[PDB]
CSV table of C-alpha atoms and ligand atoms in Angstrom, one decimal:
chain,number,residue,atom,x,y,z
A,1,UNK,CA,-41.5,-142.2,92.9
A,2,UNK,CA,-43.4,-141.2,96.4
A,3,UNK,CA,-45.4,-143.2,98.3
A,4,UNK,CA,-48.9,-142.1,99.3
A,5,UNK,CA,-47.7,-141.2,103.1
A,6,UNK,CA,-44.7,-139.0,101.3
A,7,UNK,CA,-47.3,-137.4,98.9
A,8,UNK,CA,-50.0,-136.7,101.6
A,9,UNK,CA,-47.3,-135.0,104.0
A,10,UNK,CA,-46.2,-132.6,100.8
A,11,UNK,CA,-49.8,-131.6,100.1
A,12,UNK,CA,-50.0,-131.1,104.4
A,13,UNK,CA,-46.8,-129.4,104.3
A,14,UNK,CA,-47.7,-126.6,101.4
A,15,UNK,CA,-51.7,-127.0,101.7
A,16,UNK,CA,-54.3,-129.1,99.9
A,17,UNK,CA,-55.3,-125.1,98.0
A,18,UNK,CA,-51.9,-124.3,96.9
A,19,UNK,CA,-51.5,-122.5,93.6
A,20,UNK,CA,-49.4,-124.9,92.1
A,21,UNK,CA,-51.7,-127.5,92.0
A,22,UNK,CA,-54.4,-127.6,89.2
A,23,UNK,CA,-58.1,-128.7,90.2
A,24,UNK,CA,-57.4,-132.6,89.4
A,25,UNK,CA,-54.6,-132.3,91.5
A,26,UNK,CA,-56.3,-131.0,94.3
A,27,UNK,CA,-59.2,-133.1,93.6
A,28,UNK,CA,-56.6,-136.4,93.8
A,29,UNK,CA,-54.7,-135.5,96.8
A,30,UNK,CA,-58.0,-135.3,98.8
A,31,UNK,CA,-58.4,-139.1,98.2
A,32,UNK,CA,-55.3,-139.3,99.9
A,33,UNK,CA,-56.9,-138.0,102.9
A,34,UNK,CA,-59.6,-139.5,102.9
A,35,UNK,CA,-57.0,-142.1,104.6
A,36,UNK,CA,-56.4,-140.2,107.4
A,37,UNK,CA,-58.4,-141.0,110.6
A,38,UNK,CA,-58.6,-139.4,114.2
A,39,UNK,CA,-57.2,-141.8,116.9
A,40,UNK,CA,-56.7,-141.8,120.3
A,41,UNK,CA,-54.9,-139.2,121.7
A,42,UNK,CA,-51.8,-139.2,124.2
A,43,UNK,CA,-52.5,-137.4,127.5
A,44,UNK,CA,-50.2,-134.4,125.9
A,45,UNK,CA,-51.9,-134.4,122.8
A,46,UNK,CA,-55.0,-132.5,121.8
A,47,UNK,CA,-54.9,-134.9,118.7
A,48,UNK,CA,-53.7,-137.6,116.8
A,49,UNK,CA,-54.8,-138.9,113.2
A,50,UNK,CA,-52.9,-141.9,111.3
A,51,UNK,CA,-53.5,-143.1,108.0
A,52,UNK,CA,-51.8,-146.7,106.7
A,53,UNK,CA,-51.9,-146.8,103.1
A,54,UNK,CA,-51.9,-149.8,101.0
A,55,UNK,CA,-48.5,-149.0,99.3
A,56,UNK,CA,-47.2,-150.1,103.0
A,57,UNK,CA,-46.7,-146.2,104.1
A,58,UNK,CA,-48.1,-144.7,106.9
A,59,UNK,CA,-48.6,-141.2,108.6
A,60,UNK,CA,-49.3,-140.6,111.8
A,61,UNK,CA,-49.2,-136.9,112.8
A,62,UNK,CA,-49.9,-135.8,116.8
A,63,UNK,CA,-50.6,-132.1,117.8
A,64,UNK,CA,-49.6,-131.3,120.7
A,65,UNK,CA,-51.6,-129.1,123.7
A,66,UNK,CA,-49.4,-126.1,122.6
A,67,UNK,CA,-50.1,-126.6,119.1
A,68,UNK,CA,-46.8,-128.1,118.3
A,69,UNK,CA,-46.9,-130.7,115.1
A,70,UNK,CA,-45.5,-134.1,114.5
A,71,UNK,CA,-45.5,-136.3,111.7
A,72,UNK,CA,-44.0,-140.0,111.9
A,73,UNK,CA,-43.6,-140.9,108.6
A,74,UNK,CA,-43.0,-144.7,107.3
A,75,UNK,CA,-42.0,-145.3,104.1
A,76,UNK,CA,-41.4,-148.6,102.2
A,77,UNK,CA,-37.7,-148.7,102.1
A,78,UNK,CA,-38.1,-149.3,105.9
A,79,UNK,CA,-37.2,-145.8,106.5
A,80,UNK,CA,-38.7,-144.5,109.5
A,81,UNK,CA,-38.7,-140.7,110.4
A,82,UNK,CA,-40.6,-138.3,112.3
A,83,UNK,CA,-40.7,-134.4,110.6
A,84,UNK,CA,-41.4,-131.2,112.9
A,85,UNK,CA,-44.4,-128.8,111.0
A,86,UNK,CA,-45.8,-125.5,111.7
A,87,UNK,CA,-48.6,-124.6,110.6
A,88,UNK,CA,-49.4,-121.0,109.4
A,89,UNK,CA,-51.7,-118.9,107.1
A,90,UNK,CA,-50.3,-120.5,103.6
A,91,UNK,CA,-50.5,-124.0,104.6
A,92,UNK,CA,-53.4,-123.6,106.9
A,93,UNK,CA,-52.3,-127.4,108.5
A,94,UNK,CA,-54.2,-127.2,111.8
A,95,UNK,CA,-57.4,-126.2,109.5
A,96,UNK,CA,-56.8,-129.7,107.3
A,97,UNK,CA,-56.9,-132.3,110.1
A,98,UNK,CA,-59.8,-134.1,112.0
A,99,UNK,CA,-59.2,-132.6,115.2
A,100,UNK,CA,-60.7,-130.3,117.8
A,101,UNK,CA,-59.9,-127.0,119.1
A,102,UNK,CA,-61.2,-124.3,121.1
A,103,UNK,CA,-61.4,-121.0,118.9
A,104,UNK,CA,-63.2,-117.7,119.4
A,105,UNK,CA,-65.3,-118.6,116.4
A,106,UNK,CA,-66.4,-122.0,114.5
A,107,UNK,CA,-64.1,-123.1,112.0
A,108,UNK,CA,-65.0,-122.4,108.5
A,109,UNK,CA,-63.6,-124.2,105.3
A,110,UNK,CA,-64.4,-124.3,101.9
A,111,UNK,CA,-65.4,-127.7,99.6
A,112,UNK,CA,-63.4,-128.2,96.7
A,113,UNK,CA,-64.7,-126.8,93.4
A,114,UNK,CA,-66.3,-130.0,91.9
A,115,UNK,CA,-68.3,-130.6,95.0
A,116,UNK,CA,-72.3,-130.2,94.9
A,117,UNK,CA,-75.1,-131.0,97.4
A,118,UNK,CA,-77.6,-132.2,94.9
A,119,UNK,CA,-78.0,-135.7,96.5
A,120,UNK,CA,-77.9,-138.6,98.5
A,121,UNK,CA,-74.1,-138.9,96.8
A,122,UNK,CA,-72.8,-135.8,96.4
A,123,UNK,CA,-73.7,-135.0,100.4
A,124,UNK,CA,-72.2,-138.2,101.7
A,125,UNK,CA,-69.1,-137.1,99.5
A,126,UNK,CA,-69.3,-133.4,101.2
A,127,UNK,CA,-69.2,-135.2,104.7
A,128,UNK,CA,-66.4,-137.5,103.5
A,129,UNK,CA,-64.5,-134.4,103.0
A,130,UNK,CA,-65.5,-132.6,105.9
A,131,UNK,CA,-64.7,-135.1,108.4
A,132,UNK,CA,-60.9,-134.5,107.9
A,133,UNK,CA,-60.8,-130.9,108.5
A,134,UNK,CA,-60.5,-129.0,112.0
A,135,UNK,CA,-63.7,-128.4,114.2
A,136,UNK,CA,-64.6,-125.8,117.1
A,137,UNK,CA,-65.3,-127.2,120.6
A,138,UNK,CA,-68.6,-125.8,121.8
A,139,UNK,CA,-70.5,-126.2,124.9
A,140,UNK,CA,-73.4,-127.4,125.9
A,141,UNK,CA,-76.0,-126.4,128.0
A,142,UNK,CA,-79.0,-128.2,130.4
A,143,UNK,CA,-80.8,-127.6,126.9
A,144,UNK,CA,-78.6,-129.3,124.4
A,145,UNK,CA,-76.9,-131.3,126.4
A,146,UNK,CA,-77.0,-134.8,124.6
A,147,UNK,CA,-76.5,-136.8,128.4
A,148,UNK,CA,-79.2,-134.9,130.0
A,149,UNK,CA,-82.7,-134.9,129.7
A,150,UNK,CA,-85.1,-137.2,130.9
A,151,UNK,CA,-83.9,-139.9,128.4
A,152,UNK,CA,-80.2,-139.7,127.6
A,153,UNK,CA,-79.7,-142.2,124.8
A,154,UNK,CA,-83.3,-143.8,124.8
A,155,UNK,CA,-82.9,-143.9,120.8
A,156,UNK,CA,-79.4,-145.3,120.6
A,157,UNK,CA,-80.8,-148.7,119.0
A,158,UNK,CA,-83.1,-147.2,116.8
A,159,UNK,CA,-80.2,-145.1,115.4
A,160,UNK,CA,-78.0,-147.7,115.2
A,161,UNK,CA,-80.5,-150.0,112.3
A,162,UNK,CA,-80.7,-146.2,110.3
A,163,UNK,CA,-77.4,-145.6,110.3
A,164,UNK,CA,-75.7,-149.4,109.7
A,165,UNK,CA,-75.7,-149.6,106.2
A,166,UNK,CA,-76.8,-145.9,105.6
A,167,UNK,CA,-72.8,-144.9,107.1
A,168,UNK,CA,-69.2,-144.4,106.4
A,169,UNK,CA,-67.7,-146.7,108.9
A,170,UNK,CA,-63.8,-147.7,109.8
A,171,UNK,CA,-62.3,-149.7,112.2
A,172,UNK,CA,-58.8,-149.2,113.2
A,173,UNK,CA,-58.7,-146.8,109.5
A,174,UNK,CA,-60.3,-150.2,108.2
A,175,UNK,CA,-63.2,-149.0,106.2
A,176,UNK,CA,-66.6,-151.2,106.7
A,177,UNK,CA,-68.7,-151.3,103.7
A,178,UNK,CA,-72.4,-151.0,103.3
A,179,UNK,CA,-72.9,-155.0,103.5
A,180,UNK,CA,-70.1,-155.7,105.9
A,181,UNK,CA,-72.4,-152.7,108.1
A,182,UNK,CA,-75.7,-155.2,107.7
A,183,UNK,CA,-73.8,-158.4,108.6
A,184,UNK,CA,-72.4,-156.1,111.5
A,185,UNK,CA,-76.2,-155.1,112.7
A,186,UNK,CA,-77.5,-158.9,112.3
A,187,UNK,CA,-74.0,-159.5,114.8
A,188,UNK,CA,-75.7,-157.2,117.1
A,189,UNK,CA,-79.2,-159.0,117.3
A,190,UNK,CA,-81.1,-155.7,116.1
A,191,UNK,CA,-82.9,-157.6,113.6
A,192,UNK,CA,-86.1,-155.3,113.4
A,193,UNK,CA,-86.3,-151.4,114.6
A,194,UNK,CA,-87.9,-151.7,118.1
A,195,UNK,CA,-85.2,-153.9,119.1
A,196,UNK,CA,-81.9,-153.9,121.7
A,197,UNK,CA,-78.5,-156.2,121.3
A,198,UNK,CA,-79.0,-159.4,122.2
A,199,UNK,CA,-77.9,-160.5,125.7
A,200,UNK,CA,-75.2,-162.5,124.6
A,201,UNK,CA,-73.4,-159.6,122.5
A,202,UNK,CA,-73.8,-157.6,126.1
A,203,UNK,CA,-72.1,-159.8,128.1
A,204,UNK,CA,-69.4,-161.6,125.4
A,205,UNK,CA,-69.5,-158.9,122.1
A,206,UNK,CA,-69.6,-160.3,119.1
A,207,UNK,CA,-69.2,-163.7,118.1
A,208,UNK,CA,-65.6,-164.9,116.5
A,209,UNK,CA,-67.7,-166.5,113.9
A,210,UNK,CA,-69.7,-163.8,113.2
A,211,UNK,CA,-66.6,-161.2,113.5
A,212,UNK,CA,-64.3,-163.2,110.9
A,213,UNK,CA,-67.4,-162.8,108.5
A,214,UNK,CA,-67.3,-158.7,109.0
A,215,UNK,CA,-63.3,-158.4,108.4
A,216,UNK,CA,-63.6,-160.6,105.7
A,217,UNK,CA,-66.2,-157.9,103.5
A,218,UNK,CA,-63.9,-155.1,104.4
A,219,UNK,CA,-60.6,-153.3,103.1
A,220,UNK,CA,-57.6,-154.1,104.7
A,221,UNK,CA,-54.6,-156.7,104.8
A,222,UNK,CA,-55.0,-159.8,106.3
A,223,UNK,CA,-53.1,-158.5,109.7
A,224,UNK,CA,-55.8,-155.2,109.1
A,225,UNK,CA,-58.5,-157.8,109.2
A,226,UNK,CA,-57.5,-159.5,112.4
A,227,UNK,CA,-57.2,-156.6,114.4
A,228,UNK,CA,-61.2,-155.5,113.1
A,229,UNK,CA,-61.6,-158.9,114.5
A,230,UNK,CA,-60.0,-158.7,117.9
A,231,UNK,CA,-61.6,-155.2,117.9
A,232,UNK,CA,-65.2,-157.0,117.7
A,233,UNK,CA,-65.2,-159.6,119.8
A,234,UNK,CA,-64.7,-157.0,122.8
A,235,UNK,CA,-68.2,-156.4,124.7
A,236,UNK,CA,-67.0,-152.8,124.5
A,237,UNK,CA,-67.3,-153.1,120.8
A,238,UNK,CA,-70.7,-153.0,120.3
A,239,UNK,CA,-71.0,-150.1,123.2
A,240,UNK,CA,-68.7,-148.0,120.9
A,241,UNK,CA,-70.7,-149.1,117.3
A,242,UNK,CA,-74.1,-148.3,118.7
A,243,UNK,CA,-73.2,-145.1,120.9
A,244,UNK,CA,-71.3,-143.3,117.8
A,245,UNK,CA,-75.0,-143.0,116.3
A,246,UNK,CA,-76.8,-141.1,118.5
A,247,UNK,CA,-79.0,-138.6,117.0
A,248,UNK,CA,-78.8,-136.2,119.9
A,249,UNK,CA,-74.8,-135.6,119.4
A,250,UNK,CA,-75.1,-132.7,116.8
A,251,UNK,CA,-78.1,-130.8,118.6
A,252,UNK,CA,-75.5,-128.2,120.5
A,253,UNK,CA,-73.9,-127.4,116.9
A,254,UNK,CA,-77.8,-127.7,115.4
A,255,UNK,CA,-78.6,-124.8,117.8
A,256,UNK,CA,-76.1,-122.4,117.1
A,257,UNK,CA,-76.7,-123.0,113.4
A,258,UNK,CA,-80.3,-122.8,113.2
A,259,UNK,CA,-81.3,-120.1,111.1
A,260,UNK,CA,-78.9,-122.2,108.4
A,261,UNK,CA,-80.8,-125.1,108.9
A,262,UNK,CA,-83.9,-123.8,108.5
A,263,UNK,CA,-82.7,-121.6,105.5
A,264,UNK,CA,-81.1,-124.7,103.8
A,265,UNK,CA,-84.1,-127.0,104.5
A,266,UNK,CA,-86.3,-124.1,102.6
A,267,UNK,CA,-84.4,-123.3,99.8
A,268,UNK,CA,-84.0,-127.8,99.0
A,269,UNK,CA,-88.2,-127.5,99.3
A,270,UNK,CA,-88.3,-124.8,97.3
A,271,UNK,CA,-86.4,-126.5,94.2
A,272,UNK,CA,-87.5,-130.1,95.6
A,273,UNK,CA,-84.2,-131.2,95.9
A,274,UNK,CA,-84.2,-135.3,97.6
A,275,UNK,CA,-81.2,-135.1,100.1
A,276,UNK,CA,-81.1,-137.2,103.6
A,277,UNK,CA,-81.6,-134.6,106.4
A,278,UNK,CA,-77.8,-135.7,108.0
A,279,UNK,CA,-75.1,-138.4,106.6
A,280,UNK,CA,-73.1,-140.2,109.2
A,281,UNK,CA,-69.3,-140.5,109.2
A,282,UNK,CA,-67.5,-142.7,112.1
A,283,UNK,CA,-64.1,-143.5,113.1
A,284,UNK,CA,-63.5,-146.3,115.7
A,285,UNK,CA,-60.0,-146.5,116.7
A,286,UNK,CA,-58.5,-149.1,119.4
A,287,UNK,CA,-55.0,-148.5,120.6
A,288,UNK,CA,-52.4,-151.6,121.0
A,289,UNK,CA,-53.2,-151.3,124.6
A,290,UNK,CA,-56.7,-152.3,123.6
A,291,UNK,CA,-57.9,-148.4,124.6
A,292,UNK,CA,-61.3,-147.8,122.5
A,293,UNK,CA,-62.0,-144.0,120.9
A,294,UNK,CA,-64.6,-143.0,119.1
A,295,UNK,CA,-65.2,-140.0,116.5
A,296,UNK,CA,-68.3,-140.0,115.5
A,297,UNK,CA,-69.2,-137.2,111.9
A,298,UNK,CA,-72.6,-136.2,111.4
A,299,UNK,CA,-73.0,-133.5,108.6
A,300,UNK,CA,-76.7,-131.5,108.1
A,301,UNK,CA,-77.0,-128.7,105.5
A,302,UNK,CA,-76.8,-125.3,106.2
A,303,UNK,CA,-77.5,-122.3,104.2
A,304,UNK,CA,-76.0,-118.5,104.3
A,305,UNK,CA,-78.3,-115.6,103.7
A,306,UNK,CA,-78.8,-114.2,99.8
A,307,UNK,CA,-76.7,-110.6,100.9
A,308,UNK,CA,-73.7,-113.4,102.7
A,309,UNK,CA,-70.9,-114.0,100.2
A,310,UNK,CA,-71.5,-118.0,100.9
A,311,UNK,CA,-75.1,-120.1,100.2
A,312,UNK,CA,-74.8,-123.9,100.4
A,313,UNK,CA,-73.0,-125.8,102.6
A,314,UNK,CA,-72.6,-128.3,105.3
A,315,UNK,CA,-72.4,-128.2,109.8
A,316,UNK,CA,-70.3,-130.8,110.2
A,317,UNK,CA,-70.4,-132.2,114.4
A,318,UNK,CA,-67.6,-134.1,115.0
A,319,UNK,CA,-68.1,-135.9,118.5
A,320,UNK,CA,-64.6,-137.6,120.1
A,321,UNK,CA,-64.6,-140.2,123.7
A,322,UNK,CA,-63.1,-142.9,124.9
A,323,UNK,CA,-65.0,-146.4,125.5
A,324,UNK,CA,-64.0,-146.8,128.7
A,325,UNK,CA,-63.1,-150.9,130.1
A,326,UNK,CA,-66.3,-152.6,131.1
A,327,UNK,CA,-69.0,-150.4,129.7
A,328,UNK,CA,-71.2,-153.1,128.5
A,329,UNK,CA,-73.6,-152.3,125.3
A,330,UNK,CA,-76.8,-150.5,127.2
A,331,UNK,CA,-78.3,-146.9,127.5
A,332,UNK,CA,-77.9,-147.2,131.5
A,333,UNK,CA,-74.0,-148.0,130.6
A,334,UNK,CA,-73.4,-145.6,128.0
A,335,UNK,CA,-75.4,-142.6,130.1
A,336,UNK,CA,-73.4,-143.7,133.1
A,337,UNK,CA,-70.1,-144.0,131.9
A,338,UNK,CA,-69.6,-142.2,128.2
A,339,UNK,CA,-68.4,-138.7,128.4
A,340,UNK,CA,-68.0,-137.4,124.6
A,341,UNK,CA,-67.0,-134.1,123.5
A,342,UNK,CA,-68.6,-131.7,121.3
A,343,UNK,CA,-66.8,-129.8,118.4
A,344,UNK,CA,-68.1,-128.3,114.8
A,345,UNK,CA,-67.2,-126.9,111.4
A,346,UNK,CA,-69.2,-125.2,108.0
A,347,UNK,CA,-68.2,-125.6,105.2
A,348,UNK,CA,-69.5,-124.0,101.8
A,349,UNK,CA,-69.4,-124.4,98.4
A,350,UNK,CA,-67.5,-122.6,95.9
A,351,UNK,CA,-69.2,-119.6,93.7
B,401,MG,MG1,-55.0,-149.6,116.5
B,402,MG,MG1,-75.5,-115.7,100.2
């Protein structure tokens, strides 16, 4: 029968809502793309997600600037093919990927129907969701802007210890689980919550000691687990790792959305619901040519008005840029060097 890669391109192909498919259906083939993970881009390509699964498939699917679609498919018989979609109002493919586009409007989706907001789990399972579908490029202004201000990046290290071990991490599609994430911070030297990386990570990254320890907690095969390892031990590593949690990312998308915010933050008081005020999401990707990207997902909760057909739901900032070569782990680094890019979704409940 199909292989995971074969499966998830069917369910891209015909879309993950298609009447066909019953509710644990639908509810299955979203763990399938949970696999798929933004990557770097080529220069003629506005995106470009890959997911390796551990049947030994693999998709990798590129958007062109004009919107064309490719999918390079490998399957286990050592079949190797790359299949030409479209994508169009049935299928609603450009709406089911983690990339960015510019659109007159911010991209709306809808969870599936066994999805909830009533925790700590249930939110982090929203965002896991959320952080595979499209997202609107916004701008900023001298106001939002998260590289301007007096103190561009001033709380990088601070927002590194809240969100290692309190994350969804991957490497290279190679998640990083909740203990690998503390062994990772203790790598860093940010043993206590006033302090920076140690000057040795700056200047070498992490140690090969310390990095073997990390790859060995996480997912992956054994060649999987080498390249989070030559990934680590890059001083551009830990540049990429602490810069993807900056708290300041989201505040363009935060401002647009505010009455939502504030809507959703009173109606949790109101019934004292206990969820976290965001949930972090993060995709680091290095290319064979040792090119670092990151995407960075944070997810806040957003509420429509009563008389609007939607009420709970999630703003979902999705945050893409490269690591440039030599951009050694400090705020003066990442404010002079790191350009990201800005881009968000909502996404609401069902009835
Ligand atoms: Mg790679
Ligand atoms: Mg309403």
């Amino acid at each position: 029968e199909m292989s995971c890669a074969e499966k998830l391109l069917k369910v891209l192909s015909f879309g993950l809502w298609n009447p066909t498919y019953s509710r644990s259906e639908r509810q299955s083939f979203q763990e399938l793309l949970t696999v798929l993970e933004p990557v770097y881009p080529l220069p003629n390509e506005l995106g470009r997600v890959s997911a390796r699964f551990s049947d030994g498939s693999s998709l990798r699917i590129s958007v062109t600037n004009s919107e064309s679609i490719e999918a390079e498919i490998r399957t286990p018989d050592n079949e190797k093919i790359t299949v030409l979609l479209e994508s169009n109002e049935q299928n609603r493919l450009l709406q089911s990927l983690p990339i960015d586009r510019h659109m007159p409007y911010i991209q709306v989706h809808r969870a599936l129907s066994e999805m909830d907001l009533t925790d700590t789990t249930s939110m982090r399972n929203l965002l896991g969701f959320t952080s595979k579908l499209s997202t609107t490029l916004i701008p900023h202004n001298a106001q939002t802007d998260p590289l301007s201000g007096p103190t561009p990046f001033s709380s990088i290290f601070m927002d590194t210890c809240r969100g290692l071990g309190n994350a969804k991490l991957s490497l290279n599609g190679v998640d990083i689980p909740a203990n690998a994430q503390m062994l990772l911070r203790d790598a860093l030297g940010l043993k206590d919550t006033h302090s920076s990386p140690s000057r040795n990570v700056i200047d070498h990254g992490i140690s090969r000691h310390d990095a073997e320890q990390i790859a060995r907690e996480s997912s992956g095969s054994d060649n999987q687990k080498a390249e989070v390892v030559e990934f680590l031990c890059h001083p551009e590593a830990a540049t990429a790792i602490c810069s993807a949690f900056y708290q300041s990312f989201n505040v363009p998308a935060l401002t647009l959305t505010h009455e939502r915010i504030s809507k959703a933050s009173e109606y949790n008081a109101e019934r004292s619901l206990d969820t976290p005020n965001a949930c972090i999401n993060i995709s680091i990707s290095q290319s064979s040519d040792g090119n670092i990207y990151v995407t960075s997902h944070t997810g806040v909760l957003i509420m429509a008005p009563e008389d609007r057909p939607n009420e709970m739901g999630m703003l979902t900032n999705r945050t893409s840029y490269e690591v440039p070569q030599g951009v050694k782990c400090t705020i003066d680094e990442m404010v002079r060097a790191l350009q990201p890019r800005y881009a968000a979704s909502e996404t609401y409940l069902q009835n």
